[PDB]
Structures are given as structure tokens and as C-alpha cells.
Design a protein around this nucleic acid. Structure first.
Ligand SMILES: [Mg+2]
Ligand SMILES: [Mg+2]
Ligand SMILES: [Mg+2]
Ligand SMILES: [Mg+2]
Ligand SMILES: [Mg+2]
Ligand SMILES: [Mg+2]
Ligand SMILES: [Mg+2]
Ligand SMILES: [Mg+2]
Ligand SMILES: [Mg+2]
Ligand SMILES: [Mg+2]
Ligand SMILES: [Mg+2]
Ligand SMILES: [Mg+2]
Ligand SMILES: [Mg+2]
Ligand SMILES: [Mg+2]
Ligand SMILES: [Mg+2]
Ligand SMILES: [Mg+2]
Ligand SMILES: [Mg+2]
Ligand SMILES: [Mg+2]
Ligand SMILES: [Mg+2]
Ligand SMILES: [Mg+2]
Ligand SMILES: [Mg+2]
Ligand SMILES: [Mg+2]
Ligand SMILES: [Mg+2]
Ligand SMILES: [Mg+2]
Ligand SMILES: [Mg+2]
Ligand SMILES: [Mg+2]
Ligand SMILES: [Mg+2]
Ligand SMILES: [Mg+2]
Ligand SMILES: [Mg+2]
Ligand SMILES: [Mg+2]
Ligand SMILES: [Mg+2]
Ligand SMILES: [Mg+2]
Ligand SMILES: [Mg+2]
Ligand SMILES: [Mg+2]
Ligand SMILES: [Mg+2]
Ligand SMILES: [Mg+2]
Ligand SMILES: [Mg+2]
Ligand SMILES: [Mg+2]
Ligand SMILES: [Mg+2]
Ligand SMILES: [Mg+2]
Ligand SMILES: [Mg+2]
Ligand SMILES: [Mg+2]
Ligand SMILES: [Zn+2]
Ligand SMILES: [Zn+2]
Lengths: 50, 114, 149, 69, 91
RNA sequence: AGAUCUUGGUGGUAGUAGCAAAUAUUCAAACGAGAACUUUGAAGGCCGAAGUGGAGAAGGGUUCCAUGUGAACAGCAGUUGAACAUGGGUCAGUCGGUCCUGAGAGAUGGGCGAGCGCCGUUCCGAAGGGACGGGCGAUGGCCUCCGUUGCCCUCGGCCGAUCGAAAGGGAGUCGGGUUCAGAUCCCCGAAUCCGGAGUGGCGGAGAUGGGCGCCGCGAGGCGUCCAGUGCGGUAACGCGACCGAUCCCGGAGAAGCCGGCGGGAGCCCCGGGGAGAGUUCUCUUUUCUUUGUGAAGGGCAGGGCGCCCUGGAAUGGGUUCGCCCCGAGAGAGGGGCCCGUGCCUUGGAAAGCGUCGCGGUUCCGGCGGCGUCCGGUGAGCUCUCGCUGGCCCUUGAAAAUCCGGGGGAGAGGGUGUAAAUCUCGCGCCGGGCCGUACCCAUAUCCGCAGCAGGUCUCCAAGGUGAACAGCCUCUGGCAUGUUGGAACAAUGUAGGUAAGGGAAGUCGGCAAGCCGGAUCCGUAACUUCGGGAUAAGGAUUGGCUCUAAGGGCUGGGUCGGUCGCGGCCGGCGCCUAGCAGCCGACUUAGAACUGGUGCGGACCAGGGGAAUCCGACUGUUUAAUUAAAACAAAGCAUCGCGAAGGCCCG
RNA sequence: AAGCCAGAGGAAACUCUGGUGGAGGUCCGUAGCGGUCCUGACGUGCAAAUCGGUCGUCCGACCUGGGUAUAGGGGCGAAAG
């Protein structure tokens, strides 16, 4: 909602910051074995824990 | 015609969410959030139901910034009780004190005989 | 709310410090605002006065009787009810009273009571006539009214 | 805002320490002198024009006399 | 003109609750909403505020009375009993 | 090889079912490789103010905004997207939280418990750590004298921690402008609340007068003495302040639902004057749009008063829609108070808006001209205020917080350009933390989803009409609800019609059909006398032209006997069966004429009667097969219990 | 419905008539709440209970948000397990 506490806002801030694609230079690292961010979250597909 | 919206996030028609209609210099109608209607004090006698005169009817916390004269009447018990019951109390006090004098004198003259 | 007997708000003077004490006596019927009510042993027999049962005559009836010598009023409190003083014995300091149920009780002569019948009159004569009136009656008391057999 | 009724009060109002600036507004019917104090904007209305002129040169110096026209 | 033959004040209840119950509540309701002559100021303004509470509009005197009448016959007999026992108690 | 075996993968079905709830799309152009779906323009429609409009609460959490991509997703497509990627965006003393308590939750003391712990919330507590007051002192120091500090005396029951509302209580911010996305928060301009000021910031108040001796022509000066914690009004009460503690009292906060009136505003309506548009085949001085003044002060209307003074009323009077009021003081006359959201004024026109232009700063809060005017209406609708009633075996919060009064413990100076003190005017400083974007729903929430479901509110135009009904339209919005094209087979779903008969169909008039609004008549049995009842039944209903009836404002003089073609008194006269003029809503009744007898012409909108059974009625019930005769109910009856108690939990 | 006014008739008791008034777990009927019938639609649905018309109530035992309390042999139940 528009009314929110500081802890909820901070939690949503962290959840925003980690919902981003992997950097391109990661895939050229030695022994990478990572293709894409498998922990990507969409606001309409899956909902947050709170 | 022009329809209206609340200017605050309180969306319910509660007692603290009362508005009036104002036309701005910009020629538009907006809500102005009014203050609650104050009440003049009731008399401390607790008998007659009318509220006191000469005292401005405002919210209780508005009384802190008012001058002294706006909150009382230049009379004994002024701003606390009505004039009529003050007159009644003055008469009652004087007459009951006189009655005490009368009964004291009556007993003093009654004890003159063994 | 929840009772049929009106309550009387009585203001006394504190005998030990400069203060006003406000009580919540049960209104004996016939009392009015602006009336002086006198509580004590040497109080006189008038409607609304509170005085011990031992000092009242053999046929007086009372309003708010004490079950024990020292607690507040406990008997004949419901509206329209009263208790009747029957007999005394100066020895053993006992008083026989007739409770509203008709039972006879022996109490201490020091038990205080209000002279007269409690206000609220004959409340049970009027038929309720409506399930809604009973609903509102028992809404102010407790959740007991709609009773399934 | 407060409305000054006569000239003498406006002169001593404009000489107060808090007086930031004075505004002169020429309307069709009157001339308004508007001194900006710490709490109020005191306005003096002058129906005629010659008295407005004498108050124009009699203003205390060191005060912004900015014209609204 | 006369509007009802016999129901009077209980005409608001319609056909409901039974004739005898309406007849029984009729007198209680007439006494309930009646205005009694105040015994303090002499005006006919004593009307019921709540059950057992009677208040006068003029002198603002509040009296504790009956549920439906200003005083019950029981309480009047009690007041007479108390006055006679008081005058018998002293001499 | 089996176990309706476990996991994974793949077939036929099958290019099949299907992409059919809520009326609808069409033309041209642009970008683009590509257009039924994107964008723009034109046209036709829909939502029709109880919206498909404009904003919020909960919930979501970046979905908001800009740019780009066309892999996957948006059950067709897409040049589009709530997709993907890259950047950006939420600014507060005065909007909320924060404070208060509510229903309640919950420590400590105590009790219980093997024990984690739980019972209890004032009950089995030495439960006040505070105080301007006075004394003892340390002089800490600008040691004058007031601020520090320790102890003692005196006073001190929130009698109980603490938590508990973004809808309750709760001081005080409004107007204009501005962005791609933020504003009551940013900028501009006007205010306001709270807290602070020790060295006291300025004024004003307190508060600055009489008496006696002298001097002095008088006025006026000198000395002494005495007052002086304000003043006015008969009163209601008023004035700009107006010494005062512990303590006490009171008020505000602080109160249900419904009815009927009245005042004010906003909107609606009508008549003109402007400005700009629309029509002009003919007519239309015509049709449409627009035509501001915030908070906060001052003044004035208006509304209200169960406020005061004079006076004393029956031949009772006053008065409301209703009421109701009066020797406990009517009517009448004169005052006082409260609210003042209305008008004027400061704010204020400089801003805003509407038009007509002129320069450019690639993208100016640019510059300029003109205007922003006069009126009338009302059972109109919505808010708000006020008055007065009705209902209750229902009586409709608490606490923070603020204020007034009683009392006078004390403090202040010796007549001084004075003191203590000040709720008066102005001045100086500060207001920390958190939230603030967006959606708020036939696509941003829940229902596995862009799911016909569910989800709390605010605002509310014109016509018809009783109406927030239904139907049409304006402001605003949208593209027909996850696809289109071509045909018009059966069967279906939804909607109509049907000659003659009229329930013969069927378990059963199921379904459909009939009736329906308003006016005028006229209404039975039975009945608990209230009802039945819109009983039943009958007539009328359009258009046009009139005719009556139902109101409100003013003014009615007999005149120069004269000078403030006008005014004071008076010789100077009989509207007194009331007239003259002006203005104004709708409503009712009647008449004539008239149309192919059609007229509540769409919409809205009871089929009726005679009985039997059951339940008295209103209400409730098996969410998702049973709404009933079941449950409840008032009424009636019985039982237990006087508190060391009845019933019950533990 | 009570209450009230006026007129008329009455010896009174009182009665009759016309207005006023606006009561009611009152009636028709929106919104809301509910869910009778078509045993309609749908029934691999829009929907793991919905949709259309027709319906019941619509000032009260009314509808509803939020905050609270009651927890499993327990709660709560105008009562249908
Ligand atoms: Mg979801
Ligand atoms: Mg205004
Ligand atoms: Mg029962
Ligand atoms: Mg195998
Ligand atoms: Mg085998
Ligand atoms: Mg197919
Ligand atoms: Mg299909
Ligand atoms: Mg339409
Ligand atoms: Mg909306
Ligand atoms: Mg977007
Ligand atoms: Mg697709
Ligand atoms: Mg994304
Ligand atoms: Mg204590
Ligand atoms: Mg709290
Ligand atoms: Mg609040
Ligand atoms: Mg915005
Ligand atoms: Mg203005
Ligand atoms: Mg009078
Ligand atoms: Mg201008
Ligand atoms: Mg917002
Ligand atoms: Mg949906
Ligand atoms: Mg889920
Ligand atoms: Mg269609
Ligand atoms: Mg389409
Ligand atoms: Mg959709
Ligand atoms: Mg046929
Ligand atoms: Mg036929
Ligand atoms: Mg047959
Ligand atoms: Mg057959
Ligand atoms: Mg049928
Ligand atoms: Mg019938
Ligand atoms: Mg005709
Ligand atoms: Mg029934
Ligand atoms: Mg029966
Ligand atoms: Mg149900
Ligand atoms: Mg069912
Ligand atoms: Mg069913
Ligand atoms: Mg019976
Ligand atoms: Mg009803
Ligand atoms: Mg009904
Ligand atoms: Mg079916
Ligand atoms: Mg069973
Ligand atoms: Zn009084
Ligand atoms: Zn009285």
C-alpha cells in the first residue's frame, strides 16, 4: 500500500535490487556454469513472502 | 459540472473528515476541511440547561491561545456559572446564615429557664 | 444500561479532607434531584435515607439491604422490590427480615438499608410484544436471549 | 494581511526594523502602499493621487521602494 | 373526526400480537407517554425520560418513579407507612 | 509385460473440440519489410454522474515515467504492451503515523506449577525518586543578587507497568505556477500552531492621583503626608492586558436513531450585456462554451438564545407545518450574547481565466490590448448550520489534552519616569524520525490466469418522469471485452409472432401469456375492528386554443400657513365594503376544436376470485442439490438459588 | 396510530364531520443483502457453485469495513450436525 513501515520499505528495496539480470562478463569467467539469473521474480507471476 | 475529490488519504465520511465548498481565485471548486463546532460551557450549577454567554465557543485546545477576557465574564464565578444561579446562591447563603443566627438566638433565649 | 432500576448520583462531603465524594446509590422511588439524603445511625425515617436495620420499627420496609454488617447493599436491589423488617432482639443484635422471595432471614442489626421501595416500578407488566424488543433488552445484558430448545 | 487606516501609522510601520520592502500599486481608483513586515503585509489605500505622491517622496530611505507597474 | 373505534394508541401495531396483548399494553403505553402535573413547579411537563426516570421540562427536576406511571400505588402506600411509623417512632 | 505400479518421454484422438456473456464498427494518412488490431484525423456508436468518469483505504511492490528491442509472453496478430533491456522518479512543523484510550492484551507483587511456564491486573506489595514552598549549609559564579547542588521539614491516591485505532479523540496551510513521471511536500505569495529566550528584545498595562504647608500675578514648580495588584454598564455583559501557589469545583473533549421545518452555500434554471465558436436550402436579435477571489484579520448582513431591563396580562393572549409558551412574568418597547462557512474590505489582480495580437531565449512563469458585467427565481438536488419533536424493559464510549471559577498561602514599592506581574501589540530562534510514485480493478489485489466471481468508501450535469427507476444526451472515457473473413443448412442458446379452439398438453397452468401508471367513481364475506383493500368491478388519458382558481412587493394624504421648485410643525382630510402599480412560480379544474377511437402510444409498470392443510406475524436456516410445515419469537407454564448460594469453567 | 384545531349535535356523558399530525420489527419498490422457480444457460464451464430472467426483504432481530475474544473432543451455532 501507500502507507508502509520502514522495515517493509527496506525489504522491498532489497527485493528490487536483487531482481536484475546477470552481468554479461560473468559468462566469460573460468568455470562459470551459469547461464542466467534463475532467481528472477516478476511482480505478477509470483508474489513476495510478506 | 465539476466533480470533486478528497485532498487527503482519509476516504471515509467520518466525523473528522468533514469538508465545505470553496471557490479558489483560480475559478475552481475545492474542498476545505472544516474544524469541529465548538460548544459554549455549561453552568456548574447543573440545573438550568442553557450554555453560558460572553464566552466564545471553540474547541478545547483553541482556548489555550485565547485572551483571558474571551473566556470568562467579569462577575463572581463568571465563565463557570450563569448569573441567575449565582444570584440564587448568594441569596441562599445569606438566608441560611441568617437562619443559623435565628436558631442560635432562639436556643440562647430558650435556656434562660432551668 | 442492563438494569431497570434507575441509579441515583449522590454527593457527600468527605469528613476527613477537603473533597467531594460522589456515590451511586440505587434510587428508591420517590426521591428527586436537589433532595438531601441522610446516612447514619441517627438518620430519620424518610424515603432515601440510609440507617441500620436495628433502629427502625417493626413494620418498615427497605430498599438496598446489606447481607453482612459492613458490605454495601446486596438485597432487594432489582426494580420494584423491597425487604420488610419483621422483628428485633436487642440481645444477640439480630434482625429478622422478609426478602422479596418471601424467605425469612436473620441479619445483624447493624446492616444498613435505604428506606422505601426501589424505583423502576412494575416493569414486568408491559408485554414485550416483539422479538426485537427482547433482542434490544438482552443486547445490553449478555448473550443469552435466542434460546434453542 | 493588515489594513492601515491612516498615514501616521503607515509611516511608523515602514520605519520598523523588520520592514523588508514597500510595494506601490497604482489601481484605477486608488494607490496601495504595501510594506512587508516580519508577520504581516500592511496595506494603505490612498483614494486620491497627490497624497500618494507626497507619501512617495516622504518614504524613509534604505527601504526597497520597488514599483509594481 | 374519530379515527379508530377502540384501538386508540395501539393502532400502530396493526393486526399483530393479539387483541388481548394490545389491550393490555394500551393502558401502560398511555400512562407511559402521558404528561403529569409536576408537584414542584405546578406545570404539566413531567414526562418519562427512561424507565423509572421522570423529568420536568420547566424546573428541570428529575424524580425516580415507576416504569410506566409517575408513581406506583405500592410506593404511595410505602410512603404513608413510613410517615406513620416515623411519627409513631418519636413522640 | 503387467501391480488403476514409480519417474521420464511419445502417439491416435486431431489440425479436432474450441478461440459465441455485456449492440459496432468504417474511411484516409503516417511510421514500418510487414497493419483488421499501433498512432493521427474524419464518421457512426456505447458507458449515460448508483459511469466503462475523477480520486482514496486494504492488498500488490516498481507494475509509475522516458527511450530502445521484436527472441519468449500478451491462447489471432501487433510497428503495441502491466513483456524484455537501459536509465529516471516518491521532497512536509501545519497530510497521516507518532500521542490518548476503547473492546481487549499483558509484566511486576502474590499464587500455582515436576517443568517450559500460566493464573491473576488490583487482588495476600514498604507499589509515590516528584514539587514553585521553608530551613540547614557548601558561595560553585559578574562572591550586588539570582541561578547550582546535598540534607531536613511540609505537600503530593491516576490505587498502578506497558501495549492497543493510518475510519474513534487529537493545536496548527492555503492560493497560483511548475515535471516525461512529485507536490496542500518543490518555487512564488500570503498565513498559522507549538516550544524557547538565563544574560530580561521593544512598546503598552500595572501606574503613576489627592491633602497640607510654601514659592509663584495666574498657570506652574518645591517639601511632607496619604492612596494606588485596572476600568465601564441598572442588568444581561463589555474594554487590550488585568499579580497570585498547594488545594477544591466545574466545563470542553463527550456522544443513539428517526421525523418535520428554517437559514447559508455549491449545482441546476430563467432574462439580459460582452468574447469566441456552430447553423444559415429557408427561418432563427438565434444555438453552444465562458464570464474568479483561498486561508487568516476587520466591518456589516443574516440566523439563534431556556440571557437582561421597564411593565403586569381573562373579554385570556402570543404562536408553529406540527407544536408549544405565560403572575415561576405572556404580548409590547429597549438591550446583551453566540455563530457568522454569507457580503464588503486587506489579501486582489500583480495572480488566474477568456479572447485579439507582437517578438523571440532550438523548450520564454515572454510582451501588449480588451474583458472578467447586471439581474431574477425555487416544496428543485447535495452538503452544512440551527430550531423543535418522536422511539427505547435499547438511553446510545473512554482517556489524553485544554480551559474557567472558588480560596488567598504568598510576592511586590515607598511616591519612584517606581517594583512584583502581564492570557495585550510588535519583534528573534527552532520544529527531529517514518510513509508519500502508481493500480485500487471485466488487466497492477484474492480466486494457479489479463478468470463474466469476490473486494471498504468519497463527488455526481440536462430531458422525460414520483424518482439516485428505466430510456436518450453533455463533461470525462472506451473500442465491444483473449481473433477476424465469407455464408445464413440441421440441431441448439436468447428473443418475437401465429388463423380457429382455449389447459383438450402435463404429475402439476411448468413456461409463456393476461393485468399494470395516474385521475374519478365503486368496493364483499370474514375480522383480533387495526385490516381485508390497489378487494372485486367500471370510466377517462393525445395534440392544440383558451377560461377560471390558488401569491408576493411597494405606495394610499387635507394642503407654499412656505425657502430646509425642497425640508421641521400645524389650521390643514376621510382608503377604514380597501384600492393603484409592479413582479412571480408551478399546480388544479373546466370548455371548445381536432386526428383512420389513437392517446400511462417507447420506458416504467399488481392477473384476479372461492376455499382446504401448516406455521401466528416480522425474522433465521443446511456457503456447494432441501428456504420449509423446520429454528427463533412474544405469550404461557414449571424448576433451582438469599451469596458459606444456584448454574458453569478450571 | 396517538396528540391537536374548527364546525355541528347534545342536559350531561359525550358523539358526528372536515382538516392537521406522521406512528409502525407497516405495504409497493431502487441501492444493498438474500437466493424461489425456470428443476433455463453452462456443466473437460467465465466460474472446483457462475450467468440470464423471474423472485424475498429493503427503518430494522437491517447491511457492512477495521480492531478484538472464543482452538479441536475444543470453539461457535435463531439448531441445518
Ligand atoms: Mg494475482
Ligand atoms: Mg468567499
Ligand atoms: Mg424456544
Ligand atoms: Mg516396463
Ligand atoms: Mg507376469
Ligand atoms: Mg473448428
Ligand atoms: Mg467459436
Ligand atoms: Mg447511451
Ligand atoms: Mg471509479
Ligand atoms: Mg506504463
Ligand atoms: Mg499471440
Ligand atoms: Mg520488467
Ligand atoms: Mg500512588
Ligand atoms: Mg499507544
Ligand atoms: Mg482519526
Ligand atoms: Mg500524480
Ligand atoms: Mg475578494
Ligand atoms: Mg416578551
Ligand atoms: Mg488580468
Ligand atoms: Mg499519489
Ligand atoms: Mg474479474
Ligand atoms: Mg494462492
Ligand atoms: Mg458483440
Ligand atoms: Mg474486436
Ligand atoms: Mg479482459
Ligand atoms: Mg392462437
Ligand atoms: Mg385468437
Ligand atoms: Mg388434464
Ligand atoms: Mg392426457
Ligand atoms: Mg409461472
Ligand atoms: Mg381477497
Ligand atoms: Mg381532449
Ligand atoms: Mg412462517
Ligand atoms: Mg396460533
Ligand atoms: Mg442464508
Ligand atoms: Mg444449499
Ligand atoms: Mg436453494
Ligand atoms: Mg397460546
Ligand atoms: Mg417493512
Ligand atoms: Mg416489502
Ligand atoms: Mg438447471
Ligand atoms: Mg439429522
Ligand atoms: Zn444555572
Ligand atoms: Zn416542574
Amino acid at each position: 500500500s501507500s502507507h508502509k513501515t520502514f522495515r517493509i520499505k527496506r525489504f522491498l528495496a532489497k527485493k528490487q535490487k536483487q531482481n536484475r539480470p546477470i552481468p554479461q562478463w560473468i559468462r566469460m569467467k573460468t568455470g562459470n556454469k551459469i547461464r542466467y539469473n534463475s532467481k528472477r521474480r516478476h511482480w505478477r507471476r509470483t508474489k513476495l513472502g510478506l | 459540472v465539476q466533480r470533486l475529490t478528497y485532498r487527503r488519504r482519509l476516504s471515509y465520511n467520518t466525523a473528522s473528515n468533514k469538508t465545505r465548498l470553496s471557490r479558489t481565485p483560480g475559478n475552481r471548486i475545492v474542498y476545505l476541511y472544516t474544524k469541529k463546532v465548538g460548544k459554549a460551557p455549561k453552568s456548574a450549577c447543573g440545573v438550568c440547561p442553557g450554555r453560558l454567554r460572553g464566552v466564545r465557543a471553540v474547541r478545547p485546545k483553541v482556548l489555550m491561545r485565547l485572551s483571558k477576557t474571551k473566556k470568562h465574564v467579569s462577575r463572581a464565578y463568571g465563565g463557570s456559572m450563569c448569573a441567575k444561579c449565582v444570584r440564587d446562591r448568594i441569596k441562599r447563603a445569606f438566608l441560611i446564615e441568617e437562619q443559623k443566627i435565628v436558631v442560635k438566638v432562639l436556643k440562647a433565649q430558650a435556656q434562660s429557664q432551668k | 444500561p442492563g438494569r431497570g432500576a434507575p441509579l441515583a448520583k449522590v454527593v457527600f462531603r468527605d469528613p476527613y479532607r477537603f473533597k467531594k465524594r460522589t456515590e451511586l446509590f440505587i434510587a428508591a422511588e420517590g426521591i428527586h434531584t436537589g433532595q438531601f439524603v441522610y446516612c447514619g445511625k441517627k438518620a430519620q425515617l424518610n424515603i432515601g435515607n440510609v440507617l441500620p436495620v436495628g433502629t427502625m420499627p417493626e413494620g418498615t420496609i427497605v430498599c438496598c439491604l446489606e447481607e453482612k454488617p459492613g458490605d454495601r447493599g446486596k438485597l432487594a436491589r432489582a426494580s420494584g422490590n423491597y425487604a420488610t423488617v419483621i422483628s428485633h432482639n436487642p440481645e444477640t443484635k439480630k434482625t429478622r427480615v422478609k426478602l422479596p422471595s418471601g424467605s425469612k432471614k436473620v441479619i445483624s442489626s447493624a446492616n444498613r438499608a435505604v428506606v422505601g421501595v426501589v424505583a423502576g416500578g412494575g416493569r414486568i407488566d408491559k408485554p414485550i410484544l416483539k422479538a426485537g424488543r427482547a433482542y434490544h433488552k438482552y443486547k445490553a445484558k449478555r448473550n443469552c436471549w435466542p434460546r434453542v430448545r | 494581511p493588515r489594513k492601515i487606516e491612516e498615514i501616521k501609522d503607515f509611516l511608523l510601520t515602514a520605519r520598523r526594523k523588520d520592514a523588508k520592502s514597500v510595494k506601490i500599486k497604482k489601481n484605477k481608483d486608488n494607490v496601495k502602499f504595501k510594506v512587508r513586515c516580519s508577520r504581516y503585509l500592511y496595506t494603505l489605500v490612498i483614494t486620491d493621487k497627490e497624497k500618494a505622491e507626497k507619501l512617495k517622496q516622504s518614504l524613509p530611505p534604505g527601504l526597497a521602494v520597488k514599483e509594481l507597474k | 373526526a374519530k379515527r379508530t373505534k377502540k384501538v386508540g394508541i395501539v393502532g400502530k401495531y396493526g393486526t399483530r400480537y393479539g387483541a388481548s396483548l394490545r389491550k393490555m399494553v394500551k393502558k401502560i403505553e398511555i400512562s407511559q407517554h402521558a404528561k403529569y402535573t409536576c408537584s414542584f413547579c405546578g406545570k404539566t411537563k413531567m414526562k418519562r425520560r427512561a424507565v423509572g426516570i421522570w423529568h420536568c421540562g420547566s424546573c428541570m427536576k428529575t424524580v425516580a418513579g415507576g416504569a410506566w406511571t409517575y408513581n406506583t400505588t405500592s410506593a404511595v402506600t410505602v410512603k404513608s407507612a413510613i410517615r406513620r411509623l416515623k411519627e409513631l417512632k418519636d413522640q
